[PDB]
Structures are given as structure tokens and as C-alpha cells.
Amino acid sequence: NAEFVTQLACKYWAPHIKKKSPFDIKVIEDIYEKEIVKSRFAIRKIMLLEFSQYLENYLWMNYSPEVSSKAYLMSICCMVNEKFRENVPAWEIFKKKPDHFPFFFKHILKAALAETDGEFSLHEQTVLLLFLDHCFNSLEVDLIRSQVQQLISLPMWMGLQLARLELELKKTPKLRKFWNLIKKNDEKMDPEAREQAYQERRFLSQLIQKFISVLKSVPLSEPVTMDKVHYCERFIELMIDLEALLPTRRWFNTILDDSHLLVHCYLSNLVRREEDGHLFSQLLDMLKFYTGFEINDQTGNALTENEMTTIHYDRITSLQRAAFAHFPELYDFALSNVAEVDTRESLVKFFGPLSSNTLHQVASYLCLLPTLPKNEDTTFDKEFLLELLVSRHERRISQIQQLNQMPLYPTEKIIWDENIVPTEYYSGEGCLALPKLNLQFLTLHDYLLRNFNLFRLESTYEIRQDIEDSVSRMKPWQSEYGGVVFGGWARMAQPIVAFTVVEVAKPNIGENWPTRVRADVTINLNVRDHIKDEWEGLRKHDVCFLITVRPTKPYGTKFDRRRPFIEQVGLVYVRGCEIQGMLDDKGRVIEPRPNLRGESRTFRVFLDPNQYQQDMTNTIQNGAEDVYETFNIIMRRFKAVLETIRNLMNTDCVVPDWLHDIILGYGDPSSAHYSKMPNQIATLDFNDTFLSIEHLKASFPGHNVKVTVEDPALQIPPFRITFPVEAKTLIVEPHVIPNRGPYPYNQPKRNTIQFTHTQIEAIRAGMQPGLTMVVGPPGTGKTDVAVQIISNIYHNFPEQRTLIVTHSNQALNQLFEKIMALDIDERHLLRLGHGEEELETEKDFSRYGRVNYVLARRIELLEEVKRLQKSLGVPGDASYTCETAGYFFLYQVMSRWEEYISKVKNPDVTEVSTFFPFHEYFANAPQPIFKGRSYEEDMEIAEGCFRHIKKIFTQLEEFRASELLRSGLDRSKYLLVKEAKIIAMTCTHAALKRHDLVKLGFKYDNILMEEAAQILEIETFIPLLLQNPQDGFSRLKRWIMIGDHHQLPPVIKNMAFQKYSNMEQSLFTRFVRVGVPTVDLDAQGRARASLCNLYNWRYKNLGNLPHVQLLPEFSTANAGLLYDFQLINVEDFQGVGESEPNPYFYQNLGEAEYVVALFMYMCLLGYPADKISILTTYNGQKHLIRDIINRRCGNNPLIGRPNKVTTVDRFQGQQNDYILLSLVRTRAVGHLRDVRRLVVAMSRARLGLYIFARVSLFQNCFELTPAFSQLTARPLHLHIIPTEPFPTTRKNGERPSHEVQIIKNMPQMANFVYNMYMHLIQTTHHYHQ
Amino acid sequence: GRVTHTRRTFDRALRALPITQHSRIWPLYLRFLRSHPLPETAVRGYRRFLKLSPESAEEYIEYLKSSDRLDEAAQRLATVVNDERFVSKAGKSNYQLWHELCDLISQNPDKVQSLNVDAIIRGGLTRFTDQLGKLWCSLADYYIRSGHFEKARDVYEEAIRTVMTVRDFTQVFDSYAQFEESMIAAKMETASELGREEEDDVDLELRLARFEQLISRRPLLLNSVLLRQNPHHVHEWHKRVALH
């Protein structure tokens, strides 16, 4: 029905048509019947409608109260569900139309409340339950919040059993007065008003009744409908959403305890059918967990051991009282203890032989149920009553210890399931048993539990997708004795002949996980020459994966690509493995390879810290078998994360008191900045940000500058800039950086970048206590302002730690490059990492490099010591080390400077030069500095050389630590603990070695982070435990993070983990959705204005720098191209647009040959071949691109190799002068829906972009309408200057004096380029080869 | 009356580095600590990170313990407790036992919150191993400043489990007697568990008498328990005694 759906869209509501047809309820109902009812809510139907924008163009903009009907409601709900699946903003039509939003919520609630299986079919009931779950979980929206306000308010508890409400008001005397206020306020109400209020209050109870009756309407064994099960599971999902949301639970949990969904759920047969209701009962276990989760109903705070124990014992005490007063048989049960009545075992030995009316009257006395009339039989069974009473007054576990005993590795019952860890073939029509990490958790343990669940699901994807990799060209076949056998040959899969343990060393101190866990996998590559060569070319930190399978499909079974490949292959265990190299004749991994004779290669790998500790803990506590031993294959192309999360979860979790609320998402999101952190620096040292006083006053556009000294010629200092706290005065006070002696080469390094007012204010909010998120859009100098803030924090802080954390190596190396010209001592920088690190920075800030430089610097300090002493005229032939050097300062330099000080400050310019005995110590320096002209300045110079000798003595003092640390890594630990003023690390390294530094010198005073968006929620929440609290408070004072919600996020292991739990929602993204302040710099200087326009309109007032506005080269003409941004149409070539020659390996050979001809045109036109970037729509597209490149160009003496022939996600952190983009996608929108990947692929060309794609198929996206307007803003052809070599002096706006080329086909463009190549081959020749 | 003379005089007396000027530099910090602990902490810290001696931190901490700044005294004590090149700084002379004495005078009946006290006991027991003496002391404190519920139960259990000598049984007997109604299942079965205490000639009656005189109602169990805790050799009228 794609034809009729697209036709209805293009006639009535599809964009890109001058005329739109009027609205029609008949048309809406007809299309609805022809798609959704006829196709059972087809994903392709709702997806063609989502490409057509059926909601934002037909449903809500033309819906109405007299027009809202079954078809419109169902279509809107299905569209919103499909948008929730496809991960695009959905509720835009609702936020546009608040007029119809309460009516829409009322109609959806009416459908969800009315009879099941009636008019609204069971599919519609699943749709309504899913819509209710989504509209509850998106509660931060205005209209949905207002809809659920009166429906989930405190008067929602007005429908629970009257005795239960009475006992609730008796336990909480504060709630009785609120209910009295509600009862008095409902007096002046209308019939419809108060009736709708009561219906809203009891809608939750009515939906719980409908779901429970839908479950109970299933027989024990006789097959049932899975759609009713989906309805009940979506009801459980809405219940779990309102159990994870704090105020959604505040009233819902009372009716939860009233109706006891747990007892009926765990008593029904749908949970007893391990096939029909399995994942439903699993979500039911998680639901009972959230229902008994220790988060107090009154406060939203967790319960203590005493609190929960008192609650349980008081339930057992009320049971004892009700037994004494109303139960003759339970006399021992009354007079029994808490330890003797609280446990289900003994409690059942007492109340299992109880009778029906006995337990029913017991529940009446405990106000659990409506009382049983005299001698009558409550229709609830003995099983129901006993289950209820046991679940109420039985023993329950501490969640802390329950999660503590957990195995961090997936077992043979978990690793191959898509129910708690869906695979890479996800569809999106259902949910999986995953947590949520979007806005707010109930407790810190709850947040950590969801984090560890997502981590275990990602590790389960890494263990599930590649476990079915045993010989996997043709689904490996069985052998005799059930053995494995490779009856075929695969390229990226090969039979690993064996796998052996080599190195499982000790863990880090205190921790529970070894640091290097290495295993060598051996494979006898009797295979093709070139394929076995690509298999033998193993590199350093190269990724491989060992596959182990438990096959049962015997020899010859063919594949069914539709079915689970996991269940087709019967896999066992997949272990990722980072092979340090293959073995040689000397058994040592390949660190030129030596002459390998034979075919068998063994590669020794260690993928993670707790690599051989996850399966270890498994075979330790959970009785599972060995995963590193049943290995069968090696295949090429998070346990330590879980153990660090467990360290935190069992750690006292004492965070900053102004960061608990931010990491909780509840509370005032604007509290954690400088404006609400109460200890901001009064007169602070922002020395680095300003270079001139006029420029400082210009970077203060909203401040009234109180300049301490009017004199214009004396004022450009590191001036003290105080913000007030009369009310807008920026106090600018002059200072002078103290002298350093005679050496002008000791000029204290000042920064030379003119960071604008927004960057200055961002650094100020970073170095004023609290935390801050500096939105650094592409090109705003994010790392520059970060290093400048670290510099200002080194100006305001002599002893504190500046813990630089980054998400990748790029940010860390850029931070080193910017600290290269900052006035920092090289004995104050330390760095952590993930193994062997290629230091891309100028001077090695690495461990051994800094320790050797430290030895050399202490040698230099000893040289200065000997020079000063010999100058003072000592006796001696022997040498003194750094300890005796500190003693030498104290003994001689103290005495000399003390004579001089108590002489001169107790006084003329002549005494300034006379009373300094440091002439022979300055005998190697510029001419005598104390000029005798001004006594104060002469003493400044002399005492500056004195304090230069003092700083030398202090270098030697800090170097006695290197004299005391015999070992290299020991000096590394010591100098990273004590003298390290700035410690730079990555997130994975920080989380893998957190306890290492924690016990080896952890101090966190201010943390500055770069690439805050590429660290995960958990991968950033982990460094929140980089230390412990300090005598009752965490030492964490400040946190300046540079981030951007509009850039590419972490690309997860499986698309299903983020499809299920939105793993793409970083902490900064949740902070943006909350409303935390975003110090959004807007001064970019890397790409032109008109070319950056493809990425500036994506941010908040994203602007440019004077460099961007005035650049003589960024306003220049492109080499053989008149348009700075072209994404031209790429028609079908030879009948091929985008094709998938391999499963989903998307490529488009038409656009690909166009792009190869384009790179050839840049080559033979002189645009430098190293300025040639091939960014694509798919890695398979880039692969086919490189194929066509080396097939048509090859090793041409006229054409070099592109700079980056890479992926949209794999080209981050970089820019380009001219990017060739191959945007294959035309039939499906793909994952371009992400604003992240959109802005990425749009902001990767600083001067020119040339793309081949489908123009209408691109503009068919609602998310990318402001993108398409400026993407197709030019003609869709190759509009260039063909005969124009690299230098053509014209600008972007000038008139050219030559002929312009307009190519419309890739054959013809390549033919032009080929005639050009023949012309140049006949008219010239190169020789470099 | 002015710090100028103090600073300049100290610097001029420090021109040489003999044992001269020492008791003029440090008592200067002593007399400066009056109404201003900042110069006292300054001289203390800079001295512990200044001219070498094992008596440096000694005089520093011994001057700081006498003032209203005592965590600085403990900081110089910690400088000694690491010391980086001499675990034993002074031979027979004591720094760790003296730190334990100061921790005792801090856990003196001022901080009776009953957490800092047991923390200081574990801190002294960590700084130096305690052969049953501070063990009995801390076990008695942990049995007295606990409650009566499973808290006191675990207190007595862990104390007896890691105990070193007797009268720990008497400590847990006091606990069990005070808590003789802590559950409505046994009424503090620790009473019977301690009536079943050590076999030959230790107490054999103490916990039983405590349980039978919690105040007094009727033991009905302590007789059998004490008479099951190791009578004479097997074959005798001991069976008839257990039968009566």
C-alpha cells in the first residue's frame, strides 16, 4: 500500500508541493483502514507515513473535538510510537497545538479506559497502553504534564479501598489535611468538572483493572493471543515508567499497594508460561523491584537499614496485634519475634494451613482488602490470599547486597537472548527488558543500577553479535562427539585452533579485577594467500573477537536470514580481544615481521582490565563454565566498567552537595553554576583571558567597569576583575607579576588568543565554584578556553588539582598543545591513559618521559646550586644532592638574603647594589640589573634573582622525591600524586584505574573536561568516584566541562541498546532537556560564514569571528568550483542508485563514480590531493569509493590519495578544506534523523563541499527542512569552472573570466575528466615514483 | 610588639645552622600561637617540611598539642607516622603509643557518640597491635554502647569470635542479660549460647547466673546449659545429672 500512502501524502499533506489538498476525515479514515487496520499496524506503513509526516501535516493540525475519533486517535498514537522508535522529536504538533491537547489526552484516556476487545481492538489496546506509557514518561512536556496532573495527583488515591486510605492517613497525619483541602476545594466544582477529576484520579486504577483482567482472561496452557500479552506488557511498562519517575510514583504507589499487581501477576499463568509471558514476567520482576525499591514515599529519599527494618517489623507487629485481637490460631505467631514471623518460610509454616476466610479476615484486619461478610466466602482463592500476605510480610533483600552478589559476565542463559539485550537486527515494534537513562532516577543506587544494566546490555551485545562467529561463512556444522568443525572458509571468521591463558597478573591495589588479562589464540591459516595475509597483518591494540559456539544443527543445514542467527548457530560465548600482535619464531608477539614459516599464527590479546575476571567471577559464584576455553574461532572486521560501577554502588557515594541534585535531575538545574554556588571568588585572577584593558571592558559588554587607576599608559595587567555580589561593577584593579631576576628568557607566558566575551564568561563560570557546561560549537576555541581556564585556575590556585578529563585522545593532545605555551612548570603535569600512548604533543607529558625530564631537571637544579655556592666562595671538592641542596638554600642563601633584607628594609639605590652578595652568582646574566636609579626597582631585580634561586631550591625540593623514587613508574606515581598540578586522562582509563589513583594519590579539587558529549552518562558518572570524601565532605570543588549537544554522540555497541534505552542521551543532553545553563560560545573562525551556514543554524545564535568575517583565503574561489556548498542530485546510474550487494552494506555506485571523478577533478585541477576528503553515508559506501578510486585513478602521477576516505562518525574532531560527500540514501531516510550526524556531515568542510545524493529524497525529511533549504539552495548539478586550476584569484562573489561547466550525469562528468586526463598525458608528464 | 623583630632576628640567628637559634625559632611560634593559630600552623607545617631532624616534628607536635589547634598536631604526628625513610624514628621512644594516648584523651567522656570512640580504638589497634588489653577494652565499649537487638547480637558474636582472652564472655554476658528480651522467639538465646561457653574451668556459671538474674523470674534452661558445659569424664553419673 506504499503507492496509495505516498499518493495520499503527495495529494493532501506531503511537503514539497505548492498546493495542498484540504483536510478530510473521510480521507483520513480511508487511508487508516487501507494501511493500519489492513496491515496490523505495519512498520513500513507507519514509516512511509513518517516520511510523509502524517502527524505534523494531517492529524493534529486538522483534528478537532467533534472530529476526534477512533481512526484519528489510533493514527496519532501509531505515528507517535513510530517516531519514538525512530528517535526523532515527535510531540512537535502537540507543542504547536495546545488548544486540542487536553481533548487528545482525554480521548486517548477514554480509549485506554473503555472495554477491551470491543470497538478498540486488542491491537488498539496495545497501542493505547504504549501511548500512555510514552505520555507518562515524557512528563516534562507542558501539555502531557497537565494531562497527567489531575490524573496522577494526590487525590488519585481517592479510589483505593476506604480502610486503606484511612490507614494511610493514620500513618501520615500530614496527608489528612491535604485531603481535607482537596475535599473542601471540590465543593464549588461542577458535575462535569468533578466527574472528570474523579475519572482522572481512578483512570490508573481502571487501567490496572483492565490489564490484570486481560492477563487473567488467558488460560493456563491453551495458546492465547500475544496482542493481549503485549497490552499487559505495555501496561507494565507504563507502571515501570511511573515507578521510575519520582512524582509519577508519589500517588501511583499507594494504589499499587492497594490493588497488589504483584500478587496477581506472580499468581497468574501468563508468568508460568516460560514462552508466552516470559519477558512479561521478567519486567514483572523488575516491577516488583521498583515497587519495593527503598525510596521513601514521603521524601523521595532512600530508606536506611533502620528505616526498612522498622517498616518490616512494624508490619509484623501490626500482624501480631491483629492476631492477638482477631486470630485465635496465631497465638504463637502473635507472641513470636520479628526474626520468627517476618520470614516467608516460618510465616508460611504458620499461615499456609490457614483457611480461605481465615486469611481473608486477616487481610481485612490488616486493611489489605474489603472485609469478608459473616460466614461468606471471598471469591479470592487461598493461593491469592496467602500469596498477598506472604508478599506483604515476608523477608526481602537489600538491593545493595543483591546487586553486589551479581555476576558481571553473561552466562549461557543470557548471552544469546534479545529480550534483555536485543541484537543488531532490531525492528522496533516491541520493547526489551532494559532500563532508562533519560532525565531522573529515584535514588543513586537506582541510577547506578540502570547504568550497570545498560553496560551489561552493551557487553551482552559484544558477546551476542560476535558469538555466532564460529566458522561463519556457512553457519558452522557439527561433528562426531558433538565436536566443532569448519567445513568451509570465511574471511572475517576463521577456526582458531586453540586459545590459551598466558598472563593473568595481580589486580590494582584494593580492586577486584586484574589489570592485564592476556590469552593467546592460535589459528592454522590454511587459507587463501591475500585473505590469510589480511588475517596475519595483526597490529598493535588490534581488535579481534574469539567466538565459541555450542552447535546442534548438523552438517548441511542451510541459512534462513529471517530467523535469529544466534539460535541458528547455537553460540556459546564471545570474548573481545585486543591482540598486541602475532607470535614469531621466538614466541613473542609482533611488537618488520620476521620470516614466518608455516601457516599457524598465535595472537596474544587483552581487551579490557577485567577481561579474564568476568568469566572468572562467573565460574566463582554463579557456577558457570569456562568461556575462554570452549573457544573455537577468531573473527575480525565492559566488565571493568561494571566492576567500577559496583565499586561506586558499594562506595559511600558522597558526591558534592551541589552536584547530587544535578546528577539527580531533580531540583533546581540552575543551582550548580557560579550564580548559585555561594563561594564565588570576590576579586579573582582571570589573568589569561584579557590582554588589553579596553578589550577586557569590551568582553564585559554588560558590566560597569570600575577601573582602580585612570592612567591609560600603565594599565594592561593581569588585572583583578571582581564581579559584584553598585550591583554591576566590574572592579578592574592593576597588579604586577613579581620579578624573576635578570633573565629576560624567564618571561611568564601569556596567552595570545582573543577569546570573546562568551568564552571569557565561560572560563569565569568554570573557575568560580560549581560546575559549568560551555557549549562549544565547531570552531569556537573550546579547548582554547578550557586551557585558558586551567591557566586562570593555576593563577588562583597554587596547590589544587586541575584534573583534565577528555572523551578521546584528540582533546587530551590538544590540551597538551595549548598548555605548551602556558606558564606552567613541567613538573606539575601528569597524565593517565589506556596502555601504550602515542604522544601527539610537542614534549612528552608521558610517565617515563616526565620522570626522565625530572631527573634531568634535578641535575640542572644541582648545577645551579653548585654555581651559587661556588660563587659565594665555599670550600669543597664533593657534590651535594637535592636534600643537601634544600639544606644549602636554608644555610647559605637564607643567610645572605637575610643579611640583605634586614639591611635594606630596615636604604638607598647604592645599598641596593652593594648589599647583594649575588654578583658572582649572577656572573652569567645580563649586565648588572640593580641600576641604582630607583631603589625599589633595583631591589625588585635583586630579590627577584634571590627568589629565582629560591624557586631553584624548590625545584630541588620537589626533586628529592625523584631522588627517593628508585623506579620509573614509582617516580610517576609520586610526581603524579604530589607535584602534579594538572592531570589529563580519558574516561575509560579513569574508570579502569579509578581505585588505582584513589589509593595512590587521588585529589579532585577542580575537574576540567573536554568533549563532554562523547563521554556516556555512566562513563562520566564514574569519575564522580575518583576519590573518597575528606572527613565528611567530597573534595570536589569545581567542574568546567566543554560540551555540545549538537555533535555526534557515542556510537553504541548495538543499535538496540540505544534503540531501547536511548543511550545517546548524555548527562549534558539531559541537562539541556532539564534547563541547566549553557554557556554557548559563538565565535568561530575555522570555516567561512556562508559555508559554516550549513552548521551554524543548528545552535543558539551560532556566529563567527572577525577572522571568519575577514579571512582573505576563506573568501576565495574554490579550485574549479563556483559553489562553496553543493549537494547535487545523483541519478540512477545503469539502473543502480543505492544498492546493498552485501546485507545492508549500503552503497551507491552512481554517486560513488561521481565522487571519484570529483576527487580526480580536484587532483587534475590542483586542489591539493591531501585536501580531498571522502565522507559518505555508509562505511560500505566508503569502501566501494576506495575501490573505484584505486580502480580508475590507482597510482596516477596526476592524482594522489584523499585525506580522509572515512565515515561520518569516524571523521570527528577534524575539519577539511574541501569534502567530497557520497550521500547514497534515497529510498529510506536511514539514521540521518540524528541532528548529531546531520551537523557532523555538514560541518566537516571549512571551504568547500561537493556531494552526490538524491535531492528530493533528502528534502523528504522533516528533521532536515532547514538543512535542505540551504543544501539544495543551488542547482543540483556539477556547476564548476572546469578549466580553472588551483589558483584562480576570484572570490566567492566575483565574476569569472572563463567558461562554466554544468554537468548533469556521472558518465558525462567522468568522460570530461578522462578526456582531461588524456590531454594532460599528451601535453605533460610527471616523474615522482 | 611587632613581627618585624621576630622575623629579622630569626633570620639573622639562622645564618648558621647549628643547634643555636632552634629554641628561639620554635618558642617564637609557641608565643605567636596566642590569639592567632595561623602563624603557629605556618611555622609547624614549614618546619615539618623544613630543616631536617627527627626532633623537629617532635617539638612541633608537642607544642601544637597544648593549643586549641590539635588536628595540626595530628598532622605533624602523621608526618612522623609516614616519615618516608625511618619507620622507627627514635628507637625506644614512642610516637604511636602517644598518638594512641591522645586518641584516648579525645575518646574520653566528651565524644560519647559511640562511633568516634570505637573508631579511635580501631585506629590505635591499627597503629599498634593490642595484645588482648585494648581488645577487651574495645569489646566492652562495643558491647556497652550498642543496643539490645541484633545489633548487640552481632556485637557480641564478632567480639567473641575475634576475642583474645576471658571476661569477653562476661562482657557478652552483660550484653545478653541486658537484652534478655530482644526477640519474642528465644528471649535472647545468646544467654543459652553463653551458658554453653568454654568447656573446662573458665566460668561455667557466670552467663547462666546473669541470665537467671536478669532481674529474676525463672531460668528453666541455664541449669541444663551449665551442666551440659563439660562435667567430669564421660562414663559417670553425669548422665543421671542431665536426667534429673
Listing DSSP states for A743-781 in one string gives -GGG----------HHHHHHHHHHHSSEEEEEE--TTS-
- DSSP track, A1134-1197: TTBSEE-SSTT--EEHHHHHHHHHHHHHHHHHTS-GGGEEEEES-HHHHHHHHHHHHHHTSS-T
**Chain A, nearest residue to B8 by Cα:** A902
Cell of A161: 479501598
Which class for A163: exposed (0-12), middle (13-18), buried (19 or more C-beta within 10 A)? middle
Which residues are paired to A1125 by β-bridges?
A1249
The Cα of B153 is separated from the nearest Cα of chain A by a number of Å equal to 12
Q: What are the chain A neighbours of B186 within 8 Å (beta carbons)? A: 337
Report helix angle B150-161 to B133-144, nearest 10: 170
Where are the alpha helices (H) located in A300-443, listed in sequence order? 305-326, 331-334, 344-351, 356-365, 382-393, 399-404
The 3-state DSSP class for residue B59 equals helix
Comparing CB atoms, the residue among B11, B15, B185 nearest residue A336 is B185
* Closest residue by Cα to residue A1184 from A1238, A1241, A1146, A1227: A1146
Alpha helices in A650-730 (DSSP H): 660-664, 693-698
Looking at the complex, report in whole angstroms how far the Cα of residue A340 sits from the nearest Cα belonging to chain B: 6
Residue contact B15–A899, C-beta within 8 A: yes
Instruction: Give chain B positions within 8 Å (CB) of A895.
Output: 14-16
Give all strands of the β-sheet with A1248-1253 in edge-to-edge order: A1125-1129, A1248-1253, A1218-1222, A1172-1176, A1204-1206
Cβ of residue A964 closer than 8 Å to a chain B Cβ = yes
Inspect the interface and report whether the beta carbons of B185 and A887 lie closer than 8 Å: no
For residue A266, which of A286, A247, A251 has the smallest C-alpha distance? A286
DSSP letter for each residue of A779-792: TS-HHHHHHHHHHH
Within an 8 Å CB–CB cutoff, is residue B15 touching chain A?
yes
State the Cα–Cα distance between residues B148 and A252, nearest whole angstrom. 38
Resolution of the PDB structure in angstroms = 3.0
User: In this complex, do B183 and A338 lie within 8 Å of one another by their Cβ atoms?
Assistant: yes
Dihedral of alpha carbons A1146, A1150, A1156, A1158, sign: negative
Edge-to-edge strand order for the sheet containing A571-582?
Answer: A493-495, A633-635, A542-549, A571-582, A600-605, A517-524, A498-504
Nearest residue, CB atoms, A902 vs list B12, B16, B50:
B12
Can you read off the three cell numbers belonging to residue A1131? 541519478
Contact A476, A549 (CB under 8 A): yes
B-chain residues within 8 Å CB-CB of A340? 183-185
In single-letter form, the type of residue at position A9 comes to A
Alpha helical stretches, state H, B33-167: 37-48, 54-64, 71-82, 96-106, 116-127, 133-144, 150-161
Q: Give the whole-angstrom CA distance, residue A985 versus residue A1164.
A: 44
Whole-angstrom distance, CA of residue A103 vs CA of residue A82: 22
Angle, alpha carbons A174-A180-A182 (nearest 5°): 110
Distances A1085 to A657, A763, A779, A1010, A1092 between C-alpha atoms, Å: 39, 19, 6, 19, 10
* Residue given cell 565565535 in the structure block: A1083
Nearest to A757 by CA among A1078, A1081, A1101, A1041: A1081
CB A784 within 8 A of CB A758: no
**Do the Cβ atoms of B214 and B200 come closer than 8 Å?**
no
What stretch of H or E contains A700?
A: none
Method: cryo-EM
What are the backbone dihedrals phi and psi of residue A982, each rounded to the nearest 5 degrees, phi first? -145, 120
Tell the residue number behind the cell numbers 560476535, with chain if given. Answer: A466
Residues A592, A601: Cα–Cα separation, whole Å = 16
CA dist., res. A743 & res. A915, Å (int): 20
Is the CB of A340 less than 8 angstroms away from the CB of B8? no
Please say whether the beta carbons of A434 and A1060 come within 8 A: yes
Known binding residues of A for ATP: 754, 759, 779-784
Three-state DSSP class for residue A1302: strand
Please report residues of B whose CB lies closer than 8 A to that of A964.
84-85
Which uninterrupted H or E stretch holds A1223?
none
Q: How many helices (H) and strands (E) are present in chain A, helices listed first?
A: 52, 27
| DSSP three-state, residue A602 | strand
Q: Which grid cell sits at A812?
A: 587530551
For A304: left if phi > 0, alpha if psi spans -120 to 50, otherwise beta; the answer is: beta
User: Chain B residues with CB inside 8 Å of A899's CB?
Assistant: 12, 15
Q: How far is CA A41 from the centre of its chain?
A: 33
Cell 514515599 locates to A297
Judged by CB atoms closer than 8 Å, whether chains meet at A335 and B84 is answered as no
How many other C-beta atoms are found inside a 10 Å radius of the C-beta of residue A256? 21
Nearest to A887 among B8, B52, B85 (CB): B52
Q: From chain B, pick out residues whose CB is under 8 angstroms from the CB of A336.
A: 184-185
Task: Tell me how far apart the 2 most distant CA atoms of chain B are, in Å.
Answer: 93
Distance CA A1250, CA A1258 (A): 15
Q: Which of B50, B150, B184 is closest, CB to CB, to A340?
A: B184
Q: Pairing state of beta strands A633-635 and A1147-1148?
A: unpaired
User: What is each CA distance from A198 to A183, A205, A261, B46, B114, in whole angstroms?
Assistant: 12, 11, 22, 73, 53
Give the Cα separation of A122 and A225 in Å (integer). 9
Distance, CA of A633 to CA of A484 (rounded, Å): 10
Residues A1032, A1038, A1040: CA angle, nearest 5 degrees: 155
Residue A874 at interface with chain B, using a CB cutoff of 8 Å: no
Q: How far apart are CA A541 and CA A458, in angstroms?
A: 20
Closest-CA residue to A750 (of A700, A797, A709, A716): A716
For β-strands A498-504 and A517-524, DSSP reports them as antiparallel
Only one residue has cell 605555551, namely A821
Burial of A187 (0-12, 13-18, 19+ CB in 10 A): exposed
Is B14 in Cβ contact with A895 (below 8 Å)?
yes
Task: Assess A1030–B contact: CB distance below 8 Å, yes or no.
Answer: no
Cα–Cα distances (Å) from A1116 to A1103, A1110, A1283, in that order, read 20, 11, 17
> Residue A1218 is inside which H or E element, if any?
strand A1218-1222
CA distance B17 to chain A (A): 6
User: In this complex, is the C-beta atom of B70 within 8 Å of any C-beta atom belonging to chain A?
Assistant: no
CA atoms of A426 and A457, how far apart (whole Å): 14
- DSSP 3-state of A1008: strand
* A891 contacts chain B (CB < 8 A): yes
A304 touches chain B (CB under 8 A): no
**Angle A1127-A1131-A1137 (CA atoms, 0-180°, nearest 5)?**
105
CB A963 within 8 A of CB A882: yes
Q: Is A500 helix (H, G, I), strand (E, B) or coil?
A: strand
| β-pair type (A542-549, A571-582) | antiparallel
